Amino acid sequence: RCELKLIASPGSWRLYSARKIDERFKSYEQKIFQRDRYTCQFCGFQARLYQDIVNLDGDYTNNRLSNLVTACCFCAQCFFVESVGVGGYGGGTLIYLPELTQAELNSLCHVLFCAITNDTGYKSSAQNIYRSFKFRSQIVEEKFGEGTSDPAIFGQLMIDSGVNSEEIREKLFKNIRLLPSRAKFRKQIEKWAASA
Amino acid sequence: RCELKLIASPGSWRLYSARKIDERFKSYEQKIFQRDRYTCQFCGFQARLYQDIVNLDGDYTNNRLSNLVTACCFCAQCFFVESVGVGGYGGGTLIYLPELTQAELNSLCHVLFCAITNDTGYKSSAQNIYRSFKFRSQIVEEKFGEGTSDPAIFGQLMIDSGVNSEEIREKLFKNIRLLPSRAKFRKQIEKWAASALEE
Ligand SMILES: [Zn+2]
Ligand SMILES: [Zn+2]
């Protein structure tokens, strides 16, 4: 699969949003789901519903097929951390978890949530993990500032303190992951349980 | 819940095993299961099959019901690290995990093996994450000598060194977790993944 990184681009979500509503694109997006078999190119989540498309280069003015790839809503919100929670888009909380990368985290969240709605006895051991990962939101606060566990604030943090190198910006924010909220995605989860 | 902690007791397994094969224990063995609702008191795993009963305080000359708690076999083998692999009991490999407790790693392994047994489209994700933890085994051997990722060797080594107290225990076991091997538990894993369907 491809690579995942927390990105806080300034005015890029405007283009990602304006493109998704632009009906010239609603024919391109039907191609992009099929060329990738409706599978997220980051964690592998495969579902016929509620899939998004993100640019790998970050520039949403270029639209060549080699750039647009499929991504679930858990991974799509990683390209716009500054907007996760703005006007209803996305939902989650930043946590400190070195043991898992971002892709392994999201693909694990799909298994947990699916094993929570489809209560199979494993709903117990699943909630005792999701809340356990949600507990790391305090550690992110004792390391960057009050309320910086909210992705809307942290997005403006890494935007204010401008760091251009994808190397220092990496070592600084190392071991910080975006844990997608179970509540803000209740509709996608339950509809994925049926469509199976 | 309670507090899960890796323990290298001197010979409590020879007592823990000798009790499990006793008829006087099997009588009220059901009461502890009925009390804790067939749920592990360390990682919250619920199942009506292949559950263990351990003593909290590590002493097996005390058997009051207020001490015997229900523990899944993942957490149960953490009270006998020196026996993991001895006599065919349990299985696993010690790894150096930074910020993740044992009770969280155990409950995490349940979810991964349920995605390996019932390959509903998450087997690659479940295997790749499990192999990410089975790699931290070398970090342990780089801090205690060769072959110390094996819990039967690492366990007996620290028994041969005089580790008797409790606060020394927490120091030498700090940020060390016992990752149960999926191969050594396939029988109980499939039994769980099958009897854990919807309705
Ligand atoms: Zn994804
Ligand atoms: Zn347990």
Side-chain angles (χ1 to χ4, degrees), chain B residues 40 42-43 72 75:
Chain B
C40 171
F42 299 92
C43 75
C72 81
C75 311

mmCIF file of all heavy atoms in Angstrom, chain B residues 40 42-43 72 75, ligand 2:
data_model
loop_
_atom_site.group_PDB
_atom_site.id
_atom_site.type_symbol
_atom_site.label_atom_id
_atom_site.label_comp_id
_atom_site.label_asym_id
_atom_site.label_seq_id
_atom_site.Cartn_x
_atom_site.Cartn_y
_atom_site.Cartn_z
ATOM 1 N N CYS B 40 -12.533 -12.425 31.953
ATOM 2 C CA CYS B 40 -11.218 -12.227 32.544
ATOM 3 C C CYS B 40 -11.175 -10.891 33.274
ATOM 4 O O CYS B 40 -11.550 -9.855 32.717
ATOM 5 C CB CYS B 40 -10.134 -12.277 31.468
ATOM 6 S SG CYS B 40 -8.497 -11.782 32.054
ATOM 7 N N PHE B 42 -8.720 -9.123 33.954
ATOM 8 C CA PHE B 42 -7.535 -8.361 33.580
ATOM 9 C C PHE B 42 -7.633 -7.733 32.199
ATOM 10 O O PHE B 42 -7.169 -6.608 32.011
ATOM 11 C CB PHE B 42 -6.285 -9.251 33.645
ATOM 12 C CG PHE B 42 -6.003 -9.802 35.013
ATOM 13 C CD1 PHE B 42 -6.503 -11.036 35.396
ATOM 14 C CD2 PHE B 42 -5.231 -9.089 35.915
ATOM 15 C CE1 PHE B 42 -6.243 -11.545 36.654
ATOM 16 C CE2 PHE B 42 -4.967 -9.592 37.175
ATOM 17 C CZ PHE B 42 -5.474 -10.822 37.545
ATOM 18 N N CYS B 43 -8.224 -8.426 31.223
ATOM 19 C CA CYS B 43 -8.363 -7.881 29.878
ATOM 20 C C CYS B 43 -9.798 -7.940 29.364
ATOM 21 O O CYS B 43 -10.026 -7.677 28.177
ATOM 22 C CB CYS B 43 -7.428 -8.603 28.900
ATOM 23 S SG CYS B 43 -7.965 -10.260 28.425
ATOM 24 N N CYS B 72 -8.292 -15.133 31.551
ATOM 25 C CA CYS B 72 -8.080 -15.845 30.299
ATOM 26 C C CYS B 72 -6.650 -16.369 30.234
ATOM 27 O O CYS B 72 -5.735 -15.822 30.857
ATOM 28 C CB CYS B 72 -8.372 -14.930 29.108
ATOM 29 S SG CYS B 72 -7.026 -13.806 28.673
ATOM 30 N N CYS B 75 -3.630 -13.927 29.911
ATOM 31 C CA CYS B 75 -3.184 -13.302 31.149
ATOM 32 C C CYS B 75 -2.776 -14.327 32.199
ATOM 33 O O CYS B 75 -1.977 -14.002 33.083
ATOM 34 C CB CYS B 75 -4.286 -12.400 31.706
ATOM 35 S SG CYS B 75 -4.994 -11.269 30.492
HETATM 36 ZN ZN ZN C 2 -7.275 -11.855 30.045
#
